[PDB]
Design a protein around this nucleic acid. Structure first.
Ligand SMILES: [Mg+2]
Ligand SMILES: [Mg+2]
Ligand SMILES: [Mg+2]
Ligand SMILES: [Zn+2]
Lengths: 38, 563, 141, 131
RNA sequence: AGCCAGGAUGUUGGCUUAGAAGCAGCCAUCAUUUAAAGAAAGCGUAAUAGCUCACUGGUCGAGUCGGCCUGCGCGGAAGA
């Protein structure tokens, strides 16, 4: 995935989830839209 | 084969044949066990199981008791089999429909018959790598496959055809007739022609007549073969396949026969090369050595062609596939050794004025007092259009001022041809360009032609720049067939290439695509096609009319020589 | 027996029937041949658009034949040959985008109200009026 | 823009058209085709009239508030995307015929096309005279 | 929020005219046809099909939606 120090919604189907405090972007449209840490 | 590999299915594969190829197949041997547990096969005739033996490499086997792991489908397919071979005559059917099963022997002879007409195909299963199943198929080759005289005779053409030009009963008594299925290359005699005598006997030294090539050939050393290994034989009987050293003219598929034998046999049809590449010996001058080799190997494969197009200096090698063309290149490095790197074909560009017109002119002071004569012309450029005439060198004679000497008034367009003939723009010829001499100057004493053509040459030069011509590359009419699932991707690839398209057409067993693509383009198109179509497509190029293209290369190949 | 399930717009509008060659092999999905290529369009392609735009539908049904209640004289040809100026969109904001007037509107209203109709004969008339007016420039009449 | 004030207004603005003319229609939302229901509501607008409001603002409460002043049967919840199609020259005209004949074919479904009857008691169609 | 579904047949656009496709370039062109028609949404975008820009009708019983300011927190944050 991507460990950008600033995760953003790259698409419309991206969601921001905060599992384990870590703020992640998970997109069930494009797997290149998977980011790790806010 | 490969019934010892997971995914193995005798039944499914049979259906596959029926569903896809089109054949209706009759099972001969079902299978005992799964892929790992492939014990052997079940005959639908002997009603036995030839469980083979692992310790020996299939050399020994045991006919067995047809175990219940598989004793029930056997009955179904045995029953389905009788019905089909029994489908050869009512004499079998009247008893078959009599509720009685016809004898296996009547089934096996009936089987051999149905195969002859291609009504049915017999399916045998085994694993060669597992050393199992192979011995039975070799047995069923005996049982249903045709012996030379188990079908009708070879037919022929005689003297431009006849009622029955050839009805050559394959016999040790009929006159010698043969076909050279293959020409192969042996470096020590220089050839090896594989022939099957359809009807006849031939012997060492016998002369033969090339019905197709109308010539005399002597068979010097008839040999039989075990692949590479060869064993000389004095004579070949009909129905025997042999290799003939000492034959130097027979093309693949050319009949070799005694005199007064059929001129033409059916094998006159062959595929068309689909890939083209070019080649160069490392040493620039090994080109003939390389060239001869390409030629010899071209005789052996009617599908490998070598034409060195004289538009450019390049040696062009055409072939049915990328492997072939590479397998055809390592053979040169290995036999007839030459070292050669392959490349790209050159570019057959042309040019033409767009529309612009003027009254351009040229002139040299050829007089200077002493020299004695001069020539000068005022010309008038126009194009016609890209593809209106067969005679690309169009022209109109007008001149009525400075009317150049009469005996070569009409002889002053052909000397100008040598500019339209080749290269004004980037070393590429001109099409459809129209020239028009209207004015000029001369004097009718002896208006020197060879130094008057300088006026014509600078007339072309100046005329060309003012007229702003264009450059039109070669673009052809491609036609493709493919399964109706790869249309999106094949057209996407054509689209990546600079290709226009022609026909919203779909076949019944596929889809016929028509596309206009460049000729410098599509290098190695065939392999890309196979890749994206699962090796299930063909195509053709029709050399259609040339079309213009914005190209950074047209000028860099003449700016290669700069000014 | 289905509504056209082959919408592939690669057909020159009118002109030659089934004009695939100029149109490109990029609409290849449909299975039409020399059997369905001269059945009905060849015999009823005169009084709609003879050298003008009349977009052809992609109807290929499973009655084992090709036939349907075809549309009316297309407004695309009506407002481009009843105009004189054969222009339209693309150069509508610079110069003449074609001609469209109340006379052309009456023509299309009394002509293309047979089968290419909507929520009225006059409503498909307003359809043709829109296909004539939204060209980008209209004659004032 | 089916807001509360627009509803309070269009409730009466849609009760009026069926309270001055003939019975209206209602068409569900199941399956309209590229040809069938599109061109069928086209021919509906063509033959039936240029006043029919094929739109549906037919909420159960908006209906009971606006329409039920007269013909209170409208108030009862209707699961329909009403294609309100009235008729000009008398009651049960071409619009009603087309709706009743479309509830079984040539459309998705016309919600049985119950319509509005001032009596509200006639299961039978208005052909009481033997004629 | 969750559920019953509906977008052209003047319209390869009248189109950069060999369309670039009822959703390539493209101008713009509700284009009545409406619980809906954009000549442009992710699928094939060069193209169907079957999920469908958009939009709403039908369901369904108490809150919902986004911003702006603010406190305190969260990630950014790896060394012998
Ligand atoms: Mg911080
Ligand atoms: Mg921190
Ligand atoms: Mg770290
Ligand atoms: Zn994403």
């Amino acid at each position: 995935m991507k460990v950008r120090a600033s995760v953003k919604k790259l698409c419309r189907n991206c969601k921001i989830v905060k599992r384990d405090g870590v703020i992640r972007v998970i997109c069930s449209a494009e797997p290149k839209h998977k980011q790790r840490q806010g | 084969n490969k019934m010892d590999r997971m995914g193995a299915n005798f039944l499914k594969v049979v259906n596959q044949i029926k569903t896809r190829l089109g054949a209706n197949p009759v099972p001969l041997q079902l299978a005992i066990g799964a892929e790992e547990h492939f014990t052997g096969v079940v005959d639908l005739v002997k009603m036995k199981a030839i469980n083979w033996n692992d310790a020996d490499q299939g050399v020994t086997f045991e006919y067995e008791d047809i175990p219940a792991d598989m004793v029930e489908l056997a009955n179904e397919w045995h029953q389905n089999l009788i019905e089909s071979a029994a489908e050869a005559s009512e004499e079998l059917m009247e008893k078959y429909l009599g509720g009685e099963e016809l004898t296996e022997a009547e089934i096996k002879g009936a089987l051999r018959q149905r195969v002859l007409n291609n009504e049915i195909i017999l399916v045998t299963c085994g694993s060669a790598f597992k050393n199992k199943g192979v011995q039975a198929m070799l047995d069923a080759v005996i049982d249903y496959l045709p012996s030379p005289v188990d079908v009708p005779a070879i037919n022929g053409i005689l003297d431009d055809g006849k009622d029955t030009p050839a009805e050559r009963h394959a016999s040790d008594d009929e006159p010698f007739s043969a076909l050279a299925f293959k020409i192969a290359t042996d470096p020590f005699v220089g050839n090896l022609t594989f022939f099957r005598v359809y009807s006849g006997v031939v012997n060492s030294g016998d002369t033969v007549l090339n019905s197709v090539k109308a010539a005399r050939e002597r068979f010097g050393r008839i040999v039989q073969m075990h692949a590479n290994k060869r064993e000389e034989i004095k004579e070949v009987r009909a129905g025997d396949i042999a290799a003939a050293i000492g034959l130097k003219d027979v093309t693949t598929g050319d009949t070799l026969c005694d005199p007064d034998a059929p001129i033409i046999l059916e094998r006159m049809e062959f595929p068309e090369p689909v890939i083209s590449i070019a080649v160069e010996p490392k040493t620039k001058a090994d080109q003939e050595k390389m060239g001869l080799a390409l030629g010899r190997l071209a005789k052996e494969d009617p599908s490998f062609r070598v034409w060195t197009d004289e538009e450019s200096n390049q040696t062009i090698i055409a072939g049915m596939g990328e492997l072939h063309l590479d397998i055809i290149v390592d053979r040169m490095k290995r036999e007839f050794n030459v070292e050669a790197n392959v490349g790209k074909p050159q570019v057959a560009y042309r040019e033409t004025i767009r529309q612009k017109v003027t009254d351009v002119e040229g002139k040299h002071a050829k007089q200077s007092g002493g020299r004695g004569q001069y020539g000068h012309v005022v010309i008038d450029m126009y194009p016609l259009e890209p593809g209106s005439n067969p005679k690309g060198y169009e022209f109109i004679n007008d001149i009525k001022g400075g009317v150049i000497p009469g005996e070569y008034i009409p002889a002053v367009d052909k000397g100008i041809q040598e500019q339209l003939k080749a290269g004004p723009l980037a070393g590429y010829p001109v099409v459809d360009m129209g020239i028009r001499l209207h004015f000029g100057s001369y004097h009718d004493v002896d208006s020197s032609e060879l130094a008057f053509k300088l006026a014509a040459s600078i007339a072309f030069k100046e005329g060309f720049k003012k007229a702003k011509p264009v450059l039109l590359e070669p673009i052809m009419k491609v036609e493709v067939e493919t399964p109706e699932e790869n249309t999106g991707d094949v057209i996407g690839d054509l689209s990546r290439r600079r290709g226009m398209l022609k026909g919203q057409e779909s076949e019944v067993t596929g889809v016929k695509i028509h596309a206009e693509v460049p000729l410098s383009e599509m290098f190695g198109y065939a392999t890309q096609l196979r890749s994206l179509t699962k090796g299930r497509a063909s195509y053709t190029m029709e050399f259609l009319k040339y079309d213009e293209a914005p190209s950074n290369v047209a000028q860099a190949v003449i700016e290669a020589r700069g000014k | 027996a289905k509504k056209v399930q082959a919408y592939v717009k690669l057909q020159v509008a009118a002109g030659m029937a089934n004009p695939s060659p100029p149109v490109g092999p990029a609409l290849g999905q449909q299975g039409v041949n020399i059997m369905e290529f001269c059945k009905a369009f060849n015999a009823k392609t005169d009084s709609i658009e003879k050298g003008l735009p009349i977009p052809v539908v992609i109807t290929v049904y499973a009655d084992r034949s090709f036939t349907f209640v075809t549309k009316t004289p297309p407004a695309a040809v009506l407002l481009k040959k009843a105009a004189g100026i054969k222009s339209g969109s693309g150069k509508p904001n610079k110069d003449k985008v074609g001609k469209i007037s109340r006379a052309q509107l009456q023509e299309i209203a009394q002509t293309k109200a047979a089968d290419m109709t909507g929520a009225d004969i006059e409503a498909m008339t307003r359809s043709i009026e829109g296909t004539a007016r939204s060209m980008g420039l209209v004659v004032e009449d | 823009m089916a807001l509360n004030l627009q509803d309070k207004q269009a409730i009466v603005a849609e009760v009026s058209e069926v309270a001055k003319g003939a019975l209206s229609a209602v068409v569900a939302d199941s399956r309209g085709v590229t040809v069938d229901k599109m061109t069928e509501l086209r021919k509906a607008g063509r033959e039936a009239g240029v006043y029919m409001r094929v739109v549906r603002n037919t909420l159960l409460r908006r209906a009971v508030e606006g329409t039920p002043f007269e013909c209170l049967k409208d108030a009862f919840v209707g699961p329909t995307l009403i294609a309100y199609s009235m008729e000009h020259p008398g009651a049960a005209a071409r619009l009603f015929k087309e709706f009743a004949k479309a509830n079984a074919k040539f459309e998705v479904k016309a919600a049985a096309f119950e319509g509005e009857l001032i009596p509200a008691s006639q299961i039978d169609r208005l052909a009481t005279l033997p004629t």
